[PDB]
Amino acid sequence: QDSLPDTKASGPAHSKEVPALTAVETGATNPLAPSDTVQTRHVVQRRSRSESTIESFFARGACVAIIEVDNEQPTTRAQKLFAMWRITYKDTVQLRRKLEFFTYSRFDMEFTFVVTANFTNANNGHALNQVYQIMYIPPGAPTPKSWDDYTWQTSSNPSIFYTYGAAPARISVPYVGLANAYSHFYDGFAKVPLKTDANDQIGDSLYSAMTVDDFGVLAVRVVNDHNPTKVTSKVRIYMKPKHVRVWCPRPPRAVPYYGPGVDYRNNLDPLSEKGLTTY
Amino acid sequence: FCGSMMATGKILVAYAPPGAQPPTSRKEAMLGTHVIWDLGLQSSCTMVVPWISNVTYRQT
Amino acid sequence: ISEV
Amino acid sequence: ISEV
Amino acid sequence: GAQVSSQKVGAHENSSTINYTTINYYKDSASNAASKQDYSQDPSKFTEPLKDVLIKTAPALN
Amino acid sequence: GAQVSSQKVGAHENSSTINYTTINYYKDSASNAASKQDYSQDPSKFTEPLKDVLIKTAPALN
Amino acid sequence: ACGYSDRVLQLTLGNSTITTQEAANSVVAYGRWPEFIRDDEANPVDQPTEPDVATCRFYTLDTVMWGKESKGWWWKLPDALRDMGLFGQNMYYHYLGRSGYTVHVQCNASKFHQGALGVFAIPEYCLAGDSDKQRYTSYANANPGERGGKFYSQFNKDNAVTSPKREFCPVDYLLGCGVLLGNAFVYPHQIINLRTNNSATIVLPYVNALAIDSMVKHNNWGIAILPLSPLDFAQDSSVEIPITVTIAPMCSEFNGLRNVTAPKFQ
Amino acid sequence: ACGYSDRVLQLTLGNSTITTQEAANSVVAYGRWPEFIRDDEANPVDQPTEPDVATCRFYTLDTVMWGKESKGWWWKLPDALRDMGLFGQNMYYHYLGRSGYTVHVQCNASKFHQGALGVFAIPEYCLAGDSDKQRYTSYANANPGERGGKFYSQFNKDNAVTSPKREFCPVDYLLGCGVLLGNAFVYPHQIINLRTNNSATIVLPYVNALAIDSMVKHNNWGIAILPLSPLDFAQDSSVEIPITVTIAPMCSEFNGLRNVTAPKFQ
Ligand SMILES: Cc1cc(CCCCCCCOc2ccc(C3=NCCO3)cc2)on1
Ligand SMILES: *C(=O)CCCCCCCCCCCCC
């Protein structure tokens, strides 16, 4: 049973008890029900808050990133034969704003990968089905310089081998934070400038940034050797928090996001024009 | 200490938890976690660096 | 089994 | 079954 | 090791308590789906963080 | 023949002991997944391979 | 019984006592009183220092003036107290420190004056900056100490790309952080509406994603005071009354002792 | 049993550990270990501050050199420690302070070196002065801090009546105070005779005519180190070995908190 409270039948009043009057200076919100200020009937309440539970509010796979990777002939100028993405919920706005209703969080994370591909050029023959490698590289591990160098041997790093056309790839991740909860907001620095420092560059940090690499990166490549004709692919990453817990509520972001921190730049006018005595 | 047995000496070894100026003088080093090693028949000294951190796990 |  |  | 629970039935067919079954296949609890049977709490730590919480029929200030 | 064990639950949903189930399908134990419930031991055969192991508060050499 | 009241309070911590004959009850943030780190939530293994009465007592900060053009003031904790007696010393001689706080905001005027102050206790109060440059506010500017900072009615972008000020630019109706001020009430708070009360009293627990952290690197709580309704008196266009903030550390403990941290505040 | 010895000691206080493989047992002055002020001997009514691990730990002073002409060195407590970390701060922010001490004197040399140091712990070590002028040694000169002072082989009277040095003139065989050094053994003491031991360890109780007093105005204990037998080695006429004094405050408590005392040491 998760239903809300029944409305109580309430009659007329002529008393020294005054629930309608209060003082919001105290910091508290007046605990009033309709029966405190109007005559009410008895209602047996069946409605429920099942869908607004923290889990139910976040129980949805959100698009957090679009990684583009090519399979073509290895030439000698900059190419996308492999790609790397810094793991974050912040290249996208939607889930970011939902998570930001709270200061701290703790959860397991589900990653789902939708992979799409197409032909780039009108025609140089075709391509056989591609296998994609998605390698997790935790902070410290060697990062690839080349689409097929030794790092891809992935002996200790976790990797997904996705076959094109198969159902979207899916994995789960534990609560991997260094703290007892994830900090959606960090008012402070990773370094302090000391009076005894040589340059004053030594103690300079980014405000509100914590560890430099936070959760590491995802390195994506096409395992197949190149066809004559070029194939371009995109890996869309869907992120879902599960077994979620949250602490300290915050006002929602009201103006557009300007990078990873609380910084605003413009469209600082969220509210519309409406006349005071206009319905 | 891999010196001769006829050799004597007292050494201070220290650990300063993060956040301040890295010690350039024994005077500053004395103020943190430290062991004053006296050389003698027991050849070796052990300083334990205690887990003192803010986060539950540090990065490698 | 576990019936809840 | 075997419950451990 | 199967887990059996009642579903909260919304629209009922013209046919009482209906159940569903759940079995975890993996060792890591991170691998698990969501139970979605989530308990609720009082808003009071946010709506009434007062040292002397007062009864609504009496004066807020006295 | 099903095998049932408790998971060591890390992050808990707002809902206690949770289990998982395992069934070997093949005759050859080589075919089996890893149980990952691995016991630990003393470093002593490496950290203290001494014939007369001594107590840390007393002189190493005497 | 006898004659007691929500409006009349005495607070005593260490050798310091506060009285108030016009309070609006008092707030305990998130319903949690300050406490010490439990053995089963403990993380640094070394024996902590608990200075008690010498640090857990009422430090009064420099008074600010509230006038008709005042847009709002802000402070960060522990930063506001970094130079306050033995609390400051303990904070700088140790790598780690945790503390709760009793915050007492003071603003009296008269039965004929008008105005309302929104006093807000914000966990992790990250503020917005100067520039096109993101997350660029410098340590020295992010931390004003006792002096605190201010809000502005609008966003003046620091244009000088050659020698940037690396300062915050806190806009009032955006709570200085990209959200709307009207919603800041989800934070622990009180209102000083001058017809009702002299003062505000908020008790803050230690709030963090960790049991303890570096007080020098990170502020746990932000105190934001904004005029929800502007000051006014009789018909005198240039009215001015004082606002005094008095703060007490509570259940303060420290880990990681070594040589003193001397931050460069220039 | 097992292998234990009078010569091998470990001392641990706070985050600091001392080891010694060549000690001559250790002394507890007057058979009294340091303790806190009991409720029935208490005199200031205000709740004391007990900083514990942050102040009751081993502060090492600047090393002095012992050579063939060295006549002796002296220090006063708490003065030697007035600038030592949080102990110094606690001492200066309070009107009252009491503390016991573990004193560890360090001087190693070699099986072929020669010499003997008399290490003495003196209650109320009043020293003699410069002049024809009685009780005239100035505060700044009476208190050298960590640096300590020295003894002299004879009394050189400060003659310049116009601009007097207002210094002590401690003569060695008179223990710097009008008595004979041979009798200083009635004081808590140890001897560092180099063929026998590296170090001396004396544990001092708080000794006074009061349960607590002003640490800034008055020193409780004096540490006097004199060469009872001169340093010598092989045939080298200019031998020199270090003497290091490491001291720990014990059961430290403080009363009368207010603004910091800043003495003028010039
Ligand atoms: C800040 C912040 C960040 C978050 C979300 C944190 C999630 C951290 C996950 C870290 C690990 O991510 C992985 C992603 C993919 C894979 C993977 N392995 C095989 C291929 O995909 C492994 C780890 O919440 N707050
Ligand atoms: C408890 O689970 C005992 C009953 C098991 C009934 C048969 C389950 C069939 C599915 C087993 C999945 C094994 C996955 C590793």
Ligand SMILES: *C(=O)CCCCCCCCCCCCC
């Ligand atoms: C013990 O295992 C008895 C219970 C079996 C429950 C049903 C299992 C269904 C899976 C059987 C797999 C057979 C594989 C060769």
